[PDB]
């Protein structure tokens, strides 16, 4: 699976808080990539491994 976010808001809140982000919002959802290559996301200053 690959990174899928229905809204910019969900992916923002994922980037901010890695552990406590909500996977399923009221109608919007997010999918975190599980792939043998682990890439670094550099949105702005904040970074998620």
């Amino acid at each position: 699976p690959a990174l899928s976010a229905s809204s910019r808001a969900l992916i923002d809140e994922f980037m901010s808080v890695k552990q406590t982000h909500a996977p399923i919002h009221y109608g919007h959802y997010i999918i975190e990539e599980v792939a043998p290559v682990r890439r670094i996301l550099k949105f702005g200053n904040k970074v998620v491994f």
């Binding site: 699976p1 690959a2 990174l3 899928s4 976010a5 229905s6 809204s7 910019r8 808001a9 969900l10 992916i11 809140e13 808080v17 406590t20 982000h21 909500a22 996977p23 399923i24 919002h25 009221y26 109608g27 919007h28 959802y29 999918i31 990539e33 792939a35 043998p36 290559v37 996301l41």
Partner: protein
């Protein structure tokens, strides 16, 4: 010959709908739209860069 390449298949959803008794897990996200009727028509991905 040792410089090799790997091929993966990346999987990706778009345009799904959640069941009616909708729930959330995180309180931070706030949307001015009504929660009962929300439907995503797009999908956001992170590019290589």
């Amino acid at each position: 010959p040792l410089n090799r390449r790997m091929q993966y298949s990346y999987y990706f959803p778009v345009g799904l709908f959640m069941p009616n008794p909708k729930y959330t897990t995180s309180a931070a996200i706030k949307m001015l739209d009504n929660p009962t009727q929300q439907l995503p028509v797009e999908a956001w991905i992170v590019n290589k860069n």
